[PDB]
Amino acid sequence: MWVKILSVVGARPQFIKAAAVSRVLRASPGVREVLVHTGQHYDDNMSQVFFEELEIPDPDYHLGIGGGTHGQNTGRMLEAIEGVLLKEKPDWVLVYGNTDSTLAGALAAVKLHIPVAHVEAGLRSFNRRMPEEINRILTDHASDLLFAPTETAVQNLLREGIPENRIHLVGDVMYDAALHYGAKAERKSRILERLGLQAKGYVLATIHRAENTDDQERLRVILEALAEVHQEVPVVFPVHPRTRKRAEAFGLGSYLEKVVALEPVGYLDMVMLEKNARLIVTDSGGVQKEAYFYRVPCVTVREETEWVELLKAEWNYLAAPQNAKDLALTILHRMRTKGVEIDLYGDGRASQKISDFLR
Amino acid sequence: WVKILSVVGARPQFIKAAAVSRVLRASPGVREVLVHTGQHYDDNMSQVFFEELEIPDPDYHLGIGGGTHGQNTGRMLEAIEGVLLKEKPDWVLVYGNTDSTLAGALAAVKLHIPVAHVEAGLRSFNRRMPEEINRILTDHASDLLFAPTETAVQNLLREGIPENRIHLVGDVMYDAALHYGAKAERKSRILERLGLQAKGYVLATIHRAENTDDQERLRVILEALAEVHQEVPVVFPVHPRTRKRAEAFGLGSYLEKVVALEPVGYLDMVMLEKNARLIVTDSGGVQKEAYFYRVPCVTVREETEWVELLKAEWNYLAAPQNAKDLALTILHRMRTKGVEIDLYGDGRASQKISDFLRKVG
Ligand SMILES: CC(=O)N[C@H]1[C@@H](OP(=O)(O)OP(=O)(O)OC[C@H]2O[C@@H](n3ccc(=O)[nH]c3=O)[C@H](O)[C@@H]2O)O[C@H](C(=O)O)[C@@H](O)[C@@H]1NC(C)=O
Ligand SMILES: CC(=O)N[C@H]1[C@@H](OP(=O)(O)OP(=O)(O)OC[C@H]2O[C@@H](n3ccc(=O)[nH]c3=O)[C@H](O)[C@@H]2O)O[C@H](C(=O)O)[C@@H](O)[C@@H]1NC(C)=O
Ligand SMILES: O=c1ccn([C@@H]2O[C@H](COP(=O)(O)OP(=O)(O)O)[C@@H](O)[C@H]2O)c(=O)[nH]1
């Protein structure tokens, strides 16, 4: 009668995916949901705020693990999570995205014969030296069910020999989340007011990929280029804390003061900032998709994206950070462009399709 | 001057590492660092192999073992990462498909250190086996894949792994059997010491978790061997977990009914295998080694990875569901031989492997 579905989350974007899935599982006939918070993101603005603003139940467990190496965090999450599984003995383990928490989750589970579904499965950058590419490859090959958000993602899984009956194209749960919480963003966020921004009167930026922040010359290119764009149109930049650290350590802190630099914001503010921006500059997966949701033109500061359909639809554009001025002009150019009318990522009911396929 | 750090953990890994490290010591500039995870620690599981196979002492003993999958794998992952940051090697070599293997590749790969997997591409197609998980994730984490068979090649291709990263080299355990044969022949007195002639017994090993962690399955086996014993003597070097399980379930008595030994060394094991009438096992290595010595095998599992042994009729599966049938299967196969065919290479898999590591750039 009752199925127990246990969710493993560690990072900001995982909390947001999980919020959408929880909603559907909460009001499901006979589903008990258990939520593990691995402790990977711990601060109030990377964690707590999302549980409160997206009405996510308090986690049944907080493993309190973070701030170490790949080896440390993965190893200790692996042991801790296994401990919890051995206690809760759930039917399904759900993991999301592609951090060390995603992998430790799946790997703890498969060795206990516990079914694993990967929510957001089959994305590839095809650069195997990326920790997130390894994480999503090893996760997919260890899961039993694979919830693909796009046709590309499906063909990626088939090509690595994963059979069709274990793959379900269900669209993207972060589109679910945008729809269902959009109205709540409307009535609660007052961030345009707090920062004194007129709608479509600024650009929005996020930057945190390690290939971008650990390399001094790439990070300088990016912060120079954003400061230049500020002169022409204000830049709002909720700065990931790792990015903040790396900028401070390489002595690029002045560029941040030269734009509208923020600590990280909750999802409601973010929606409200994403919605009312003229253009979005990012290296985030979630935010590139989100720009497209609101038909705001996007520039992705990478050599590739896993969300290729956004490039084909002309709503997103690649701009590797080789040159500061080159990147600035690319950003200012793409502001007066737009993509085609097209539906991606589904109807808003990816989460409900997931719940279905799990009974 | 290239550094190659090996990660080993258990009996079959030391046998594989021995064959390979013999070639790496002979190679100009090439320094080795050997890491022992501590997964096997009893002397007849570990130190004996180091002594008889002429393997230098490990540069590190992490002394992790005897916990859960999570505990072992997790603690190994952190520990091996710590070493790798110390030694910053150019290659990490991992072997087979223990939890040690996986902790190895996972440590290495997130540090952007190239990983090579010795014995790559094997698949049982049973994810209930912790070792099916281990080789799948290892192979997907590796930059070189030293497949031992054409099956293992094809397996890797179908999981969308590029042809350039896959080399078929044969099996280093064949290099081992070949290199150490004279020394076991000359130094093993195991036959004398038991009181056995050639062709006059049956040799048996059993340690698959899926056999030992289920009582009525283990009962099936122990009894099946006890019956066989009454007809042809059964020599049975017992794995420690197998013994401790036999005790946990109260099947102890069954081991009296055959020639139960503690675990033997490779030298003694070679002679036992060489001079047996039939081998029966749930072991990876022993299956192939039976074929090496042209001795019929029975494999007490639902599947094997070594499917070529079945097709050549050197091997036969018999899942343990019924004491009586398992015994009869065994006694029938005792009368069989497979076809003459050459598997697993020319005995120089280690040389090919060494070659490929040096010339990889
Ligand atoms: C490149 C890469 O691997 N990326 C993976 C990565 O996610 P990601 O890169 O998007 O990191 P991230 O940008 O912090 O989150 C965005 C969210 O934060 C919100 N967001 C952002 C900033 C902010 O101040 N406030 C806020 O609410 C935004 O509104 C938005 O909803 O980890 C994810 C995970 O494991 O689940 C994977 O799904 C991703 N994989 C992919 C393929 O996109
Ligand atoms: C089924 C499975 O996953 N198996 C994997 C597993 O090895 P395995 O099943 O063969 O365990 P094992 O039987 O302890 O050792 C045999 C050796 O011990 C010697 N041996 C055996 C008994 C004895 O008393 N004395 C002795 O010297 C024998 O002469 C023989 O040389 O770990 C291996 C590893 O990670 O490298 C993987 O390569 C294997 N994968 C495969 C696919 O064979
Ligand atoms: O030298 C050794 C190695 C293993 N074990 C036993 O084997 C169990 C599990 O061994 P492991 O998980 O390493 O797997 P194996 O490949 O030996 O089955 C441990 O809890 C020990 O009780 C032992 O007694 N001595």
From TrEMBL, chain B:
Residues annotated as binding UDP-N-acetyl-alpha-D-glucosamine: Q39, H40, Y41, D42, D99, E131, H207, R208, H239, R241, K244
Protein name per the record: UDP-N-acetylglucosamine 2-epimerase
EC number(s) per entry: 5.1.3.14
Lineage: Bacteria, Thermotogati, Deinococcota, Deinococci, Thermales
Signal peptide span: none
Binding residues for UDP 1: Q39, H40, Y41, D42, G66, H239
Gene Ontology molecular functions: nucleotide binding; UDP-N-acetylglucosamine 2-epimerase activity
Domain UDP-N-acetylglucosamine 2-epimerase: 24-357
UniProt keyword annotations, A-Z: Isomerase, Nucleotide-binding
Coiled coil residues, start to end: none
Organism: Thermus thermophilus (strain ATCC BAA-163 / DSM 7039 / HB27)
Binding-site list for UDP 2: Q39, H40, Y41, D42, R241, K244
NCBIfam families assigned: wecB
Pfam families membership: Epimerase_2
InterPro entries from the UniProt entry: UDP_GlcNAc_Epimerase_2_dom, WecB-like
Family of this protein: Belongs to the UDP-N-acetylglucosamine 2-epimerase family.
